[PDB]
Write a protein that binds this DNA or RNA. Structure first.
Ligand code: MG
Ligand code: MG
Ligand code: MG
Lengths: 81, 175, 79, 114
RNA sequence: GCGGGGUGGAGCAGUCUGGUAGCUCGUCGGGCUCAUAACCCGAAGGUCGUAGGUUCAAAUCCUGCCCCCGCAAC
RNA sequence: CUGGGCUACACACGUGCUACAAUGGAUAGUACAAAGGGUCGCGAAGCCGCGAGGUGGAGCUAAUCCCAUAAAACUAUUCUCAGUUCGGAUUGUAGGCUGCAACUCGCCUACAUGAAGCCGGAAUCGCUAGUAAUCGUGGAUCAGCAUGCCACGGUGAAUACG
């Protein structure tokens, strides 16, 4: 959300990420969510985000908080003609 | 003679009580400093020396000699005898003043000055650095420098090894 | 040294205008100022910004750890 | 003059607009913090006036520092590897904007025929 | 082995006199046309076979190699 | 059913919007329209907020009330013919709405940046009168999303030998 009434994050992702404090980051979390923000709580745990055909991994950082998950998982594969 | 006074006052006794010399003349001294630009651009333009020479003489306090090529090289488009860079030898009062100015004023003026490499030793006991960009010195303005270039600074010593050299320069204030 | 060849080089007093650290040494630049430091002599005054007396590598250097970046900003904006 | 040699003939507001980081309303706010007349000319200034204006400016963010700031912001999303920064790196629109046609100030001038 | 040559896609200059990329046809794009051609408007395309030299600088002057067309030899 | 694509991007064409400025721009004050829509919809006054908007709930199933300051025009001051206070892209940060949700992929605002462009090759298009040109307005679709579409009035020409 663009507004102070937010933030937004999918409950089905926030819950799994909160359970993933005891993950130890050996495992990985798949989501079909590209609309959900990144909280700092997502840091460290790689997320496999569904671009349309596959789940592409992203490693969260302090620097990619504030943004969405889809910004790190492109939809349209293009190679300079 | 701030730093010469300092030297003969404090560092010679300190340094000789450290390294345990058999006499007062084994103790290291700085023989000289040697500043050198290293210009290669002068193959294609004469104004570059006209900048660098005046600029070293301002940075340094005595005219530099334009050094020339000992041999001809085609990979640099370089004929023998061409003027390549200039140099200055500073000794005595003026090398001491140059180090004074250097550590006091100009070394901190560098972008992210966290000292300088302690490993940069020739192995015989002398030290060399290079000022990347001559505007670091105060005698010269930035508004006069058409284009920046660096220069090697050699601090030559009578020291027989890296250890003695480093301690000399640490006591004089080189980080 | 010769005559006429070298540029005007004279004893000049630097002063760090961060903390008024005074220091004599030779140079070739007035900065349009003069003082009589170290009584018995006139010396021009080549004022300057930060010196070795104040540089953080020669002194304290932990400063400027101001923010972690985007994280406190998120948490400050949304609680 | 005021961070850079602004025009002497221009009025003070327009003069301050020629600082990378400052436009007309910031200029009005600054000259109102100074209490000066904004309709006056720039060669017609005074020195103490000018110095107060410099103070208010240096309170406002520095020109070159602003350049460094925006470039750091861009470097960040280039160096992560987000979509938005791939657009910055590829030279294309970053907003949600169309590229089949009308993308000239990003792609550059008209490239060679395919 | 002896002569010519090797320069945008084709044919030809320019080399002798070092700084200069040219003429005609063609190609691409846009117009005219119901469409193609012709015509009109713009533009691209050559590091001068190649590897080295000389020169401040080489299509150009010097050297070796590699190719094509002829003529000989076989 | 979720997520993506129809919004891709070396490039070509059409149709349009914005401009390339002084018959103009910034700022202030300020006169005169028509045609339309509105029930869970229009949403007032007052207030907070630079602003987008928020709050509030009056009145209205409407020639009653609202959307709705009409803008160009005019008057004053300034800019003085300059890549400019032109132009407004593109980009960074921060806001607001809508909607479960605004990365892909909405619109709008604030600040800053300030791009190309100093009147358009060969060619080619509409128009004979309240027309062309120009300025705003409304409606539909629609939660939101228009330079597009259909209607509205304001100002208001030149020319037609043949
Ligand atoms: Mg040539
Ligand atoms: Mg479509
Ligand atoms: Mg007729």
């Amino acid at each position: 959300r663009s507004l102070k009434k937010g933030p937004f994050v999918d409950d089905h992702l926030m819950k799994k990420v909160e359970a993933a404090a005891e993950s130890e980051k050996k495992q990985v979390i798949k989501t079909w969510s590209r609309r959900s923000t990144i909280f700092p709580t997502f840091v460290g745990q790689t997320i496999a985000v569904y671009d349309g055909r596959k789940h592409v991994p992203v490693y969260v950082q302090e620097d990619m908080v504030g943004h969405k998950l889809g910004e790190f998982a492109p939809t349209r594969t293009y190679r300079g003609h | 003679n701030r730093l010469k006074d300092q030297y003969l006052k404090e560092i010679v006794p300190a340094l000789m009580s450290k390294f345990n010399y058999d006499s007062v003349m084994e103790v290291p001294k700085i023989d000289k400093i040697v500043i050198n630009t290293g210009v290669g651009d002068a193959t294609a333009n004469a104004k570059v020396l006209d900048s660098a020479v005046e600029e070293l003489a301002l940075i340094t306090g005595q005219k530099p000699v334009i050094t020339k090529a000992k041999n001809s090289i085609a990979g640099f488009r370089l004929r023998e005898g061409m003027p390549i860079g200039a140099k200055v030898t500073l000794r005595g009062e003026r090398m001491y003043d140059f180090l004074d100015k250097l550590v006091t004023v100009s070394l901190p003026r560098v972008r992210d000055f966290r000292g300088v490499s302690k490993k940069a030793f020739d192995g015989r006991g002398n030290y060399t650095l290079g000022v990347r960009e001559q505007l670091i010195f105060p005698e010269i303005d930035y508004d006069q420098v058409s284009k920046v270039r660096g220069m090697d600074v050699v601090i030559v010593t009578t020291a027989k090894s890296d250890e003695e050299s480093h301690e000399l320069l640490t006591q004089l204030g080189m980080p | 040294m010769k005559t006429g060849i070298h540029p005007e080089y004279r004893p000049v007093v630097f002063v760090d205008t961060s903390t008024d650290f005074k220091f004599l040494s030779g140079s070739t630049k007035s900065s349009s100022e003069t003082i009589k430091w170290e009584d018995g002599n006139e010396y021009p005054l080549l004022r300057v910004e930060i010196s070795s007396d104040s540089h953080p590598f020669y002194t304290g250097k932990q400063k400027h750890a101001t923010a972690d970046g985007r994280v406190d900003r998120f948490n400050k904006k949304y609680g | 003059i005021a961070g850079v040699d602004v025009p002497r003939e221009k009025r003070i507001v327009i003069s301050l607009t020629y600082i990378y980081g400052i436009g007309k309303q910031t200029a009005k706010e600054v000259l109102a913090e100074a209490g000066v007349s904004e309709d006056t000319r720039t060669r017609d200034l005074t020195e103490e006036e000018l110095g107060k204006i410099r103070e208010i400016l240096d309170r406002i963010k520095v020109e070159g520092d602003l350049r460094r700031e925006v470039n750091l912001n861009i470097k960040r999303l280039i160096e992560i590897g987000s979509y938005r920064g791939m657009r910055h790196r590829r030279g294309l629109p970053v907003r949600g904007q169309n590229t089949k046609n009308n993308a000239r100030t990003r792609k550059g001038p008209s490239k060679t025929v395919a």
